[PDB]
Design a protein around this ligand. Structure first.
Ligand SMILES: *C\C=C(C)/C=C/C=C(C)/C=C/C1=C(C)CCCC1(C)C
Ligand SMILES: CCCCCCCCCCCCCCCC
Ligand SMILES: CCCCCCCCCCCCCCCC
Ligand SMILES: CCCCCCCCCCCCCCCC
Ligand SMILES: CCCCCCCCCCCCCCCC
Ligand SMILES: CCCCCCCCCCCCCCCC
Ligand SMILES: CCCCCCCCCCCC
Ligand SMILES: CCCCCCCCC
Ligand SMILES: CCCCCCCCC
Ligand SMILES: CCCCCCCCC
Ligand SMILES: CCCCCCCCC
Ligand SMILES: CCCCCCCCC
Ligand SMILES: [Ca+2]
Ligand SMILES: [Cl-]
Ligand SMILES: [Cl-]
Ligand SMILES: [Cl-]
Ligand code: NA
Length: 241
C-alpha cells in the first residue's frame, strides 16, 4: 500500500491513520474549547452533538493506527484487510451529523427516526459487504447500502430542506450549505469503496485509506467548523426527546 509503515508492523496505511488521528483530535479540542464559552441553550446542543463527531472518530482512528480491530477477510485467494473501527465510527458519527441537520430543520422525531434508521442500515450493510467472501456478495451488499444512502440524501434534500426554509434565512442558508457538502462528500464514500480494496480493487489500501481520511476529516471537522460558526445554532431547537 502507498504510504509509510510508521510502526514497523507491515502497514503503510498507518501514515494516513496517524495523520487522521491528529487532525480529528485537533478538531475535537478546537470545538471543545470554543464550546466552553457558549451559553445559548440551542448552541450548546449543537456543540455537544458536534464535538462528539471528531471525538468518536479520534478514538476510532487511534484504534486503527495501533492495529486494534484489524482483521483479514478471505475472498478466494485474496485476504482483504478490514478495520472494524471504521464502521463503528461511521455507525455513531453519521447519525450525529444527521441529528445536527435535523435540529437545524426542526423536523419531528418520526422523520428523524426514519433518517437515522436508514442511515444505520446503510452502515450495517456496508459492514456485511466488507466481511463477505465472494465478489458477488460484496457488490450486492454495496448496492443495497448505496440505495439506503440515496434515500437518506433524498430526505435531506427534500423534506428537511423544506422544513429549514421556513425557519428564515440564517437557518436556511446554513442548512443549505451543509447539505451541499453532505450530498457530495457522502456520495464519495460508496465510490471509493467500490473502486478500492473491497470492490473492484483498482485503488489499493494505501490510497484508499488516505482518501477515506480526507473524506472523514472534511465531513466531520469541516462540517463542524461550518456549522458551529453560524448564527443558525442560536435558533430554537427541539431535540427528538
Ligand atoms: C465520517 C463521516 C461520514 C460522513 C461517513 C460517511 C459514510 C458513508 C456515507 C458510507 C457509505 C457506504 C455506502 C453507501 C455503500 C457501502 C460502503 C459504505 C459503507 C462506505
Ligand atoms: C481558526 C482556527 C482553526 C482551527 C481548526 C483546527 C482543525 C484542524 C483539522 C483540519 C480540518 C480540515 C477540514 C477541511 C475543510 C474542507
Ligand atoms: C411523520 C412523517 C414522517 C414519515 C417518515 C416515514 C416514511 C417511511 C419510509 C421508510 C424508509 C425505509 C426504506 C429502507 C431503505 C431501502
Ligand atoms: C452465482 C451467484 C449466486 C446468486 C447470487 C445472486 C444475488 C443477486 C442479488 C442482487 C441484490 C441487489 C441489491 C439491491 C437491492 C434491490
Ligand atoms: C435532490 C437529489 C437528492 C439525491 C442525491 C443523491 C446523490 C448525490 C449526487 C452527487 C454526486 C457527487 C459526485 C462526486 C464525485 C466525486
Ligand atoms: C517518508 C514518509 C513520507 C510522508 C509523506 C506525507 C505526505 C503529505 C502528508 C499529508 C497528507 C494529506 C493530508 C490531508 C488532510 C486532510
Ligand atoms: C420520500 C420517501 C423516500 C423516497 C426515497 C427516494 C430515493 C430514490 C431517489
Ligand atoms: C519516517 C517518518 C515519516 C513521517 C511522515 C510525516 C509527514 C508529515 C505529515
Ligand atoms: C497518536 C497519534 C499518532 C501520530 C502519528 C504521526 C503521524 C504523522
Ligand atoms: C468530550 C470529548 C469527546 C469525547 C469522545 C468520546 C469517545 C472517546 C472514547
Ligand atoms: C479509545 C482509544 C483507543 C486507542 C487505544 C490505544 C492503545 C495503545 C496500545
Ligand atoms: C449475494 C448477497 C445478497 C445480498 C442481498 C441484498 C439485498
Ligand atoms: Ca437560542
Ligand atoms: Cl452563546
Ligand atoms: Cl438560552
Ligand atoms: Cl495503495
Ligand atoms: Na505501521
Amino acid at each position: 500500500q502507498a504510504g509509510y509503515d510508521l510502526l514497523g508492523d507491515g502497514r503503510p496505511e498507518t501514515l494516513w491513520l496517524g495523520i487522521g488521528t491528529l487532525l480529528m483530535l485537533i478538531g475535537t479540542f478546537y470545538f471543545l474549547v470554543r464550546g466552553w464559552g457558549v451559553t445559548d441553550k440551542d448552541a450548546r446542543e449543537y456543540y455537544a452533538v458536534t464535538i462528539l463527531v471528531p471525538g468518536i472518530a479520534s478514538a476510532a482512528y487511534l484504534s486503527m493506527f495501533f492495529g486494534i480491530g484489524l482483521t483479514e477477510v478471505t475472498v478466494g485467494g485474496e485476504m482483504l484487510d478490514i478495520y472494524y473501527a471504521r464502521y463503528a465510527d461511521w455507525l455513531f458519527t453519521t447519525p450525529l451529523l444527521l441529528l445536527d441537520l435535523a435540529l437545524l430543520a426542526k423536523v419531528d422525531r418520526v422523520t428523524i427516526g426514519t433518517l437515522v434508521g436508514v442511515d444505520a442500515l446503510m452502515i450495517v450493510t456496508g459492514l456485511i459487504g466488507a466481511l463477505s467472501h465472494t465478489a458477488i456478495a460484496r457488490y450486492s451488499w454495496w448496492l443495497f447500502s448505496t440505495i439506503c444512502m440515496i434515500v437518506v440524501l433524498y430526505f435531506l434534500a427534500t423534506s428537511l430542506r423544506s422544513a429549514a426554509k421556513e425557519r428564515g434565512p440564517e437557518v436556511a442558508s446554513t442548512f443549505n450549505t451543509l447539505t451541499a457538502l453532505v450530498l457530495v462528500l457522502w456520495t464519495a464514500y460508496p465510490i471509493l469503496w467500490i473502486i478500492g480494496t473491497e470492490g473492484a480493487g483498482v485503488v489499493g489500501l494505501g490510497i484508499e485509506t488516505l482518501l477515506f481520511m480526507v473524506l472523514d476529516v472534511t465531513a466531520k471537522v469541516g462540517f463542524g467548523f461550518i456549522l458551529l460558526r453560524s448564527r443558525a445554532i442560536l435558533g430554537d431547537t427541539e431535540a427528538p426527546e
